[PDB]
Amino acid sequence: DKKWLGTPIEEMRRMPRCGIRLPLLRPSANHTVTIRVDLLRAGEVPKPFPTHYKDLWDNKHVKMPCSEQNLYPVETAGSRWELIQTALLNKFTRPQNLKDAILKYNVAYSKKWDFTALIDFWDKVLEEAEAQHLYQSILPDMVKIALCLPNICTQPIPLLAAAMNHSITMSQEQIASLLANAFFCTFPRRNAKMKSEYSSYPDINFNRLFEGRSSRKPEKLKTLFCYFRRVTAAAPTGLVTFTRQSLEDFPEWERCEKPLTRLHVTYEGTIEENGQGMLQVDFANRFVGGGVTSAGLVQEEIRFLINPELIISRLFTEVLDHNECLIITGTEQYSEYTGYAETYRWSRSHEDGSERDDWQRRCTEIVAIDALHFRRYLDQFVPEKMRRELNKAYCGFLRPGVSSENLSAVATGNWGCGAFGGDARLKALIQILAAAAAERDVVYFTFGDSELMRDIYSMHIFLTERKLTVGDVYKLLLRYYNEECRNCSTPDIKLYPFIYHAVESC
Ligand SMILES: Cc1ncc(Cn2c(=O)c3cc(S(=O)(=O)NC4(C)CC4)ccc3n(C)c2=O)s1
Questions:
Q1: Could you list the residue range(s) of the whole structural domain that residue 417 is in?
Q2: Which atom of ligand 1 is nearest to the CA of 424?
Q3: 81 is known to lie in a ligand binding site
Q4: Which residue, among 386, 389, 415, 162, has the nearest Cα to 283 in the 3D structure?
Q5: Ligand 1 site residues, Cβ closer than 6 angstroms
Q6: Tally of structural domains, the chain
Q7: Which candidate, 341, 250, 330, 245, places its Cα nearest to that of 290?
Q8: What is the DSSP letter of 30?
Q9: Cβ–Cβ contacts within 10 Å for residue 97, how many?
């Protein structure tokens, strides 16, 4: 039994090798650049632009904790930033000290926020010497980088709001200062359950990571402290780009004359290790990062924990609409892990060996595309639901302006499976069709399912040998719904056997 099938992986396009030299990095109407481009040098910490803190407290930018507008009622408006500095600049020796410090500027949640997982991690999971290193070295270093925020993030950060096509390029050092603030729960207006302003934004403050007794919380905390220990000990020097992409024009799928592209399908390997230099898919929730700052521990959350710079997308990325995606370039891997969901464990620190492009960004491109949640199995075969998934994957794969020869393969796998109720064989065909329309090859990981690997390979080879276009395949999907799903009240025949019969008997 072969471990992979199709086009050899060596024949598939990878980056920065197959991806043209970059244009000059510069701020523009659609691109926020928070560093001095003229001073950007390999191995040097980037200098913030502007030199002095500039504040914007409005509906179009992140509300910074260091803003002079970040006020609290005193029994007279007091400075919340001054209160945060006072609270955090105390020695911590016991977990209660950290809980009490966080609650000093979060008084309204002193009875709502549970800190059980944080207390248990520090007291009941860590050995004495590990606890000592956490409160004597890691936590004070995290406070210092959090409190440096006005000197590090000097430029207002725009919100990547619904329907905006915009990019933010910032330094990994800027991201570390922002994530240390999210750990200490300092972002204002991001907490109320009945908030309106940020109701369509994911949670950013880390308070839900400290709650309850799940055995997976110590693993999430080890993963995040591994990152914080690394970035406070030695300031990272690269940049990271966050791009919100929203397409107006979608293909008329039934009329698409494009042929299928190449396929490498395997039941072994992972997107992050075997998909190096390729567009890597994040099986996202519509609120990017899903339950990373709370209970979730599946594909998306794991990637967000091992590449924590992805977490900051939650500060400024509004919930994704059907025609949108988020593309993140440059995030670094700080941890290695084993397992998944209830078996997930942090293994050790990871030294990322990825090369950097001309903007000092690690050569790792990740796209967040959220699959639909199907209440009933048969719902996904509804043409509107199929067209939705095709358009979502297509938006994640398309790079408008870029030529096909400069596009890496897509490294993906069973998107929206299990809990979301997605049929793996249909979702594989949808991704294959979207990648074909976007003119990219596919590297598909089946995560131990050898039978699924064979089925996808046999279907792909059957359609390609018969020269079936994207349109031809899409029409077969429409026929399956009409013959087996529309009139079905209980399907009698599976999708792939239907397609094989429909094509072989026509
Ligand atoms: C047959 C199945 N289809 C889906 C399943 C769920 N699943 C995954 O989705 C999965 C995804 C990856 S990965 O390559 O995407 N890497 C990250 C986790 C992002 C870092 C690695 C392991 C996985 N494992 C074990 C798993 O069980 S199992």
A1: 1-506
A2: 3
A3: no
A4: 415
A5: 270-272, 299, 302-303, 340, 413-414, 417, 445-449
A6: 1
A7: 341
A8: T
A9: 14
